[PDB]
Amino acid sequence: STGSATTTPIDSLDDAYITPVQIGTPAQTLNLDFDTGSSDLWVFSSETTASEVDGQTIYTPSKSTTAKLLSGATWSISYGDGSSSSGDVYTDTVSVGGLTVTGQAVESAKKVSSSFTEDSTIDGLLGLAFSTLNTVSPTQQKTFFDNAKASLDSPVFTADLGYHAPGTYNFGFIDTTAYTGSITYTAVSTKQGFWEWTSTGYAVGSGTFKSTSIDGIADTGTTLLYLPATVVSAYWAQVSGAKSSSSVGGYVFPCSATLPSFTFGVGSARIVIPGDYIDFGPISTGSSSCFGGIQSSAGIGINIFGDVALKAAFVVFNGATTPTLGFASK
Template identity: 50%
Template structure:
């Protein structure tokens, strides 16, 4: 099968403007609902996302507006055609969820919001109404819900007939103010699909069960800044890097791409993290790890400090940053220096792209980590393969 390389929009940038650190961190807190550890700048409390205002007194906090969490183009989007003759929507490809939902004509107010392409099943000769409803809720109370159709979905040169498509009838304010995408395509395991009374097959599950792709894999190379990236389905592009792809078994019991990560390295010194695991999540921007790792990392960067106002660690932009590596399985992968400095924090300082996971008992390897590797998600064999990228 020919490789598929649709261009992606850079994460956390808005047409070249500086990335939104607060939005990236708050989005992760909302997504996983973690409470703060020593260094978590945001947390979910009482069903809202809050910013920790004082590092010493974490009971002092104020709410982060729900609509700000999605602002700033916090995702990569990929063009996907739905229907016959079809309309092309820009969808957020997300390995941390399992729903394919879109802005649709079922949402009565859709025309009031510019910047979105709308899917209308009445204009597709292959659309069919299906049973079931769906409802996605987030920690701050934002949500999206609606009904279900089946239609032909085309991603690059991969065509999936009879794919379930979840049509938004209701969208809360955070989605309405996110002009970056026309919906979401979930790439996690089918068990966490939200369609009720019975979950529906995800696009990748259908690609595999209908023998549309072989091998049963999808891969991702995330671009940096304006650099193009791509997803591929049923094809492994060995030209991405000269380094070998190393495979690790996946624990999908929670529906995520969860793998062991029992060591890390700082400045060439490897350190053990017994029993630690991580989730590979293209829907999270930052790299989130335990407080002890965060403290040791920034303790090795001259001038680094936890910034109460910013809600995370910052460091001098011209500081010498030691090499940082994190393991997936038995292999360490280096995080590109360009990405450890996530964005401009003002006064000659940069936001750290590696921050606290709060009270979670697993790490989240988001785009800050994933941009340094080429990843093969082997859904057929429950494995992931990673190769260090040359750039």
């Protein structure tokens, strides 16, 4: 089997992407944030504290003839950005782009943190990291991909995120029309539960390529590109007036600037992030200080190839017995 679904930016900055997901019988369609940095499929629901729901579409398990309470199971998650959610668990039928999993754990939120409430466009998350990170207790649950894998034509999914435009998540096949040149594959460590890999270096603009190993994760659920402070300083030094602002929480730059591109290495191959992808707009409405899309990972404890990086590539998440990651230009 295969599946194919369009993923759509939630706003004009590509702060996140939402993909429609069918849950239950009859289908309840919720728009979920597909997150290769976590491993829980959780939703706003009829159980979510009323004051914490603000415009989201909810899953109502009592209206699904295929929903079953997973008795005794609870979940609780905290994300790198300080947000969180928790609740109980149902199993139900879940379909993405025509690909159906029966008995998928659907984690129903009883509580969500303010960041989730305040984002009316995101009805929940669909985790696509390794199932070892799933938070369900006392019986850990599998991700949608892990459950689908054996049925797929090939044990893969691909992320093709758009810049200020829709893109595509495919399951079970590689669309050879969706990228240019060849796909370069690179090794993955699953030791921390992530799609963790090592970039071979970087360049800033038309500058020379610096060969250096950068360990990090491919994370569709993180907006920006978080890299070591040395790398990030080298980038922003090429933008007149750019500075790290402790008050704002990262690098800012004059909105009048033209940003240079940023290149990262995948083996001997190179992915070029155009400068415009690195512009996250005014820090507040009407400001002439703009927020940068490349930020320091110092104090996160891991480098993160988030959407800023991934949307410059066609990315293969290869879930074969020994997982790997593939990157192509597009």
